[PDB]
Amino acid sequence: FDRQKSSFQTRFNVHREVTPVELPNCNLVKGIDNGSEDLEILPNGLAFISSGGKYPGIMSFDPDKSGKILLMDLNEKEPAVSELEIIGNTLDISSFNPWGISTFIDDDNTVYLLVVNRPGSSSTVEVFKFQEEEKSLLHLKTIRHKLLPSVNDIVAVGPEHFYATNDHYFIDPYLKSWEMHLGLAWSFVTYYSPNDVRVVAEGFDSANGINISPDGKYVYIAELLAHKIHVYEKHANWTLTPLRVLSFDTLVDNISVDPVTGDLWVGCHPNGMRIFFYDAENPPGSEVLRIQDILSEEPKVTVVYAENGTVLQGSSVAAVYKGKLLIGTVFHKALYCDL
Ligand SMILES: [Br-]
Ligand SMILES: [Ca+2]
Ligand SMILES: [Ca+2]
């Protein structure tokens, strides 16, 4: 049993404290107070934000909060958020509980938004068409599959084609909690497409963020409780082969990819106890990593922002646009910063 307490302390990084890395002009995004756990910025500076999601056992400040997709135009001087209206008749909006998101832009420049949805106990991926002028999301399709039991994030490679992380093997939240505490490491990654759905990697200690290189040749997978980012070669038939594993002293959550450089921008939880077992007197901090030249022998890892949560609690995602840094959290606020 002594080895079991030791594994727990490592996985949840229970002794980690946060050396500050400050940025002089950071401003909280007004209107975001109950989570902004995933976000994605289009090439034109429009940012989608998944907000208000509720997860089994995750702290929530407003238990009756409703899940929303928000829009920010980061070309504005002081960008404000607006709530995107979901239209259509193929989705039960009352149970809409968004988590990870991804975008896909077609040849005709149609923008698709894929949204992990956790209505009740089940797990789906919702496909929307973005209507920019109307600021709305037209629902198109609900995707469910036996190989998508517990979806956490996806990276879209087509309008209804994506890689998905399942952060647990089990669907029942009690068995989920048990599997996470035991550290079974049965989390796995699924490739979904209309004609072909298959597991492409497995054996993860909670796979969370997932993303892809701008040329589509590599897939990146955050293994939250192992504190690792896995680099996979992505083949023409959509299978994955392991290539590199980077290790960290922090719980890596969601991965963003800068399209110009290919850099990874990662939202991280330095101490796992503070993000999983909330204590208002001991709140989770925030930490953002930039990772450059991830294939080379010594990848350059920089802590771009870090704090103990006196401003932003529970950073889960971070992405950059034309000199600005946007940081989201699993159940708290959002921060917009000059780099
Ligand atoms: Br922390
Ligand atoms: Ca995502
Ligand atoms: Ca997460």
Side-chain angles (χ1 to χ4, degrees), residues 4 6-29 31-54 56-61 63 65-76 79-107 109-120 122-132 134-140 142-145 147-173 175-177 179-194 196-216 218-232 234-243 245-296 299 301-339:
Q4 222 46 33
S6 174
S7 196
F8 180 92
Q9 288 190 335
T10 313
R11 295 168 69 232
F12 293 82
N13 231 27
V14 303
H15 297 134
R16 168 83 205 272
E17 308 288 352
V18 182
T19 302
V21 178
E22 309 170 7
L23 286 174
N25 189 21
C26 290
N27 296 109
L28 293 160
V29 178
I32 294 182
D33 289 276
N34 290 289
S36 47
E37 79 93 20
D38 204 22
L39 59 84
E40 188 152 321
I41 313 175
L42 300 183
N44 66 5
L46 294 181
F48 295 95
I49 302 159
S50 180
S51 70
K54 305 164 212 184
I58 295 201
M59 175 67 191
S60 164
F61 292 130
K65 72 213 273 196
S66 71
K68 303 174 169 59
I69 310 302
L70 316 176
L71 186 69
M72 284 176 79
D73 187 348
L74 304 183
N75 304 287
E76 299 179 1
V81 292
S82 48
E83 171 181 1
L84 288 181
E85 193 197 357
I86 291 177
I87 64 178
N89 286 295
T90 44
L91 171 70
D92 176 22
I93 299 190
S94 76
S95 65
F96 183 62
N97 184 29
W99 212 242
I101 65 176
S102 188
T103 61
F104 176 80
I105 311 163
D106 222 341
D107 301 308
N109 281 288
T110 310
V111 176
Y112 296 89
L113 180 71
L114 281 67
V115 181
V116 176
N117 190 11
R118 309 290 297 247
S122 64
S123 150
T124 70
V125 178
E126 315 289 348
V127 180
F128 303 87
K129 183 155 76 73
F130 177 52
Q131 301 178 325
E132 178 173 347
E134 300 90 331
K135 290 193 191 310
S136 54
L137 296 162
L138 173 59
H139 188 255
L140 297 177
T142 297
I143 296 175
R144 27 175 91 85
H145 195 282
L147 296 184
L148 300 171
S150 187
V151 179
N152 181 287
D153 199 6
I154 82 288
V155 54
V157 294
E160 49 185 318
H161 314 63
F162 54 91
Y163 295 86
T165 55
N166 294 282
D167 54 11
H168 295 80
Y169 175 91
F170 288 108
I171 303 179
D172 166 66
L175 285 186
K176 269 189 189 137
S177 209
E179 102 171 266
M180 162 161 297
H181 275 282
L182 297 185
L184 299 181
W186 288 358
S187 163
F188 62 99
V189 175
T190 291
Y191 170 74
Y192 178 95
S193 69
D196 174 20
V197 189
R198 37 192 156 99
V199 175
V200 290
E202 65 184 86
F204 293 94
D205 191 0
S206 192
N208 270 247
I210 188 170
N211 215 316
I212 194 167
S213 60
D215 63 8
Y218 307 96
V219 162
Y220 311 116
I221 303 167
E223 195 183 5
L224 178 92
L225 289 173
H227 321 162
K228 294 175 178 163
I229 291 178
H230 300 252
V231 182
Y232 282 79
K234 165 164 161 297
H235 302 286
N237 69 354
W238 307 100
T239 60
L240 306 182
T241 52
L243 191 154
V245 179
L246 283 68
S247 303
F248 306 89
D249 184 34
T250 193
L251 281 62
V252 289
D253 195 350
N254 292 324
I255 300 164
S256 300
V257 174
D258 173 64
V260 192
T261 58
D263 295 346
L264 284 64
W265 290 80
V266 188
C268 310
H269 310 289
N271 192 297
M273 293 287 309
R274 304 193 170 104
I275 192 66
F276 281 104
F277 306 102
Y278 184 72
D279 171 8
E281 309 282 50
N282 194 24
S286 289
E287 182 166 54
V288 174
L289 306 184
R290 170 188 195 189
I291 305 169
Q292 295 165 275
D293 308 321
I294 194 162
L295 300 181
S296 67
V301 181
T302 310
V303 179
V304 175
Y305 180 77
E307 64 150 294
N308 63 4
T310 58
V311 179
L312 190 71
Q313 301 172 12
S315 66
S316 54
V317 63
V320 292
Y321 180 71
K322 295 191 178 307
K324 304 274 190 297
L325 171 68
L326 179 61
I327 316 174
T329 62
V330 2
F331 52 77
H332 191 239
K333 302 179 182 168
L335 203 57
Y336 195 49
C337 298
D338 291 326
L339 283 166

